Design a protein around this ligand. Structure first.
Ligand SMILES: CCCCCCCCCCCCCCCCCCCC
Ligand SMILES: CCCCCCCCCCCCCCCCCCCC
Ligand SMILES: CCCCCCCCCCCCCCCCCCCC
Ligand SMILES: [Fe+3]
Ligand SMILES: [Fe+3]
Ligand SMILES: [Fe+3]
Ligand SMILES: [Fe+3]
Ligand SMILES: [Fe+3]
Lengths: 164, 164, 164, 164, 164, 164
């Protein structure tokens, strides 16, 4: 039997599908960077996409751990074009901040229901979101200091292309 | 400059999006097996989902190798339920055979345009499809011999749950 | 269900039986060389016979991979005598060319039916036939320069007797 | 000079050709098991076929050791269908017993001619036949206890599929 | 005896000589880069010249494999000078695209003659050409971003100078 | 600025192009030996050709070390038919002696202009030419003793085919 409420279950399932979209969005940023010839930035985005899938799968497994079931929904078509390298990363930061607020909404919902198990499960994503936002802000700071100079952009493209 | 025709480029991009859906479909079959309590079958489908992503990324990189560009499209909601283990794998076989026919269509299109580079690139997928169909047919044959016997279904579950 | 046409399955099954005969013929060339006291040439022919069996089993497994079935037919009696070492290799070359044309006929039949999976599977044998024909032409060219000189035939026998 | 009588050479050469047919018969049993979807039983039959070839080559080398020569004959078409797993292994047992009696017949002919070298050479095959018959009787005994229960057949298929 | 048509042997021998010129052209681009003081770009061109020689030798060995012989022709004087770093690489890309179409022409000729051995042999060069064209396009894209800035050109020189 | 005289740079550039032709000539002797079926002699010529390229590149790098520039010239069509094995190696000796005399002419020109750096650089080639002439003279002496005997020519072919 399911030991999460149907509201909490739906919120977790909604977030799972939101995490799938996050993965798709970053792949679409890879398609942009590859079109612009920045294979290192594209590689970073491909790695980021795979990292979002592991986020989706940890929502996946917690739902089944609490006796729930996952239902996959349609994934909306992501943007595919940005006005420059910085515009794509600014869009990524705005998306991660939106993801953080979506995690907060589940946390507050689970808290109102005294679903302590789900509140505590979500804390990993709270801490992880602090990292994901910080890593994009750091990239944005390096792009702002580069100020469009291709010598510095090349060094950061190769650097982000070294992602593990 | 793009050295594939727009027609061939669109055929390859369409197939990339079909591989994305294929991955999503197998993940949704995993959600079905996990809801039914068959963690080994669900594990098999998760491994299958990741294999489809490598198919999409192969199309991805070939498109850019020939000067094209990838555009990600919306992904349709896959089914989430099947009338049994055999029904799910029969749906899997029918989908893989459909995937093979779609690859065949790109091959014949590239062939009539004398796009030998794309014809030759597609050979890996032709050979790979032979094995994808054969492994589902083997599973279906084993499920047919099991004939609903739970002791034998349990053997098949943990066996497929060992997937590499 | 079988996903090769009955025409294509019959062509592959016919070739499987042809590969069995090719194996048998080379064993019968071994019986001739051993009767003549040339154990190195005989050893080469025994290794050649085993190589043909691996070709036959490759056809075997591809047929079942495509949902077909193998039927073994009677194997005709091969010749057991040749007019010297060079005559035997002339027969080997003539046989290998016949095998190559038989592979070609399956390839053209599969291509007419747009059976791309079988066309691509047969590529390995086209390439292998290039090597097998070349191996015998090289031996024949050496025998033509040898002109029957026993010192040269002995070293060639010892060398071919070293085949792994 | 040949130091076996022609009668004994013909007996040994006839048996060599019988071993070739035995190999072909077991390969044909593999085509049956593979058509029935029992890849472990099929694997067992493919290994049995290669072992029969080593028997043929043992007769081969002894014939030449005694100054005789081997003549390969036509290989009859083996049956390709059986009425079940038990029926195939029963046919295998009946064939191995027939092979044993054929070896016994050479032994008695050689001993009548006081060909002690051939009498002694055949001792290895007498002993080998004891094991070949016993290995099939053991398989038949397990199939009789299994009585068609797929739970037991699956494990026996995988077990025989491990034959080295 | 030659088992390729004389038309195909001439097409292959012509392409071998074209590969020889290709190495010479790249060596001549090296002389240009070395005169301009870019040892990394020159090093890249010297590696490219040796790669073209391995292409010529592949054609060489296949011609003899099929019973033909190679005839070397005069090598035309390549251009010595270019209007800049980008101008040289644009000429290289235009040449590689010309080499690809010449290979395409041999494939279509062999295919029309049903010379499946040569058709299948040429697939390696089709695939290699995709890599050769792409490698130069990437360099041209990086040179376009450099926009003449010596700070960025020094990065590309050192980077291309690390080619193995 | 260029610190070799224009006369010395041209003499060196001419010799560079001469070394390219020597490489091409030896490749063409390889085409002859391969057409005649002597893969060992052909192997020797292929190694010699690659050795001539390192000679050319040594001239290449010294020219730029002295501030000069390399200009590649047209390469003449080499001969492709010799009367026999010994005639080809006799032509190889004759060519190397011509190369040695061409090096002598540069050395005497450099010494007259008091270009001690070029005089000292050319000593490596003086000593190297002594070795290259000597190794062809040794092969010719063995071919003269063979006196056309194919058993002995085969031994020399195998021996020269072991060249590293
Ligand atoms: C080498 C680069 C890899 C990039 C991967 C990009 C993935 C994008 C995925 C979009 C969503 C489609 C459905 C994915 C299901 C994945 C299931 C994984 C189970 C472990
Ligand atoms: C030196 C051995 C030469 C043998 C020639 C035999 C020609 C007739 C063969 C008939 C039976 C063939 C059985 C082959 C079994 C191969 C199993 C391989 C499994 C991967
Ligand atoms: C590192 C510089 C390379 C420059 C190559 C220039 C080539 C010009 C053509 C001259 C003849 C080349 C002969 C090459 C023979 C190679 C044989 C290889 C055998 C495996
Ligand atoms: Fe996330
Ligand atoms: Fe796929
Ligand atoms: Fe074969
Ligand atoms: Fe090339
Ligand atoms: Fe030289």
């Amino acid at each position: 039997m399911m030991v999460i409420s149907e509201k909490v279950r739906k919120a977790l399932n909604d977030q799972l599908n939101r995490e799938i979209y996050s993965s798709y969005l970053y792949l679409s940023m890879a398609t942009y960077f590859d079109a612009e010839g920045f294979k290192g930035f594209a590689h970073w985005m491909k790695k980021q996409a795979q990292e979002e899938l592991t986020h989706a799968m940890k929502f996946y497994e917690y739902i089944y751990q609490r006796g729930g079931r996952v239902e996959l929904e349609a994934i909306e078509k992501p943007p595919s074009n940005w006005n420059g390298i910085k515009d794509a990363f600014e869009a990524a930061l705005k998306h991660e901040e939106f993801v953080t607020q979506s995690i907060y909404n589940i946390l507050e919902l689970a808290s109102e229901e005294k679903d302590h198990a789900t509140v505590s499960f979500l804390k990993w994503f709270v801490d992880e979101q602090v990292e994901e936002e910080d890593q994009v802000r750091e990239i944005l700071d390096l792009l702002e200091k580069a100020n469009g100079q291709m010598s510095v952009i090349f060094q950061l493209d190769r650097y982000l292309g070294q992602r593990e």
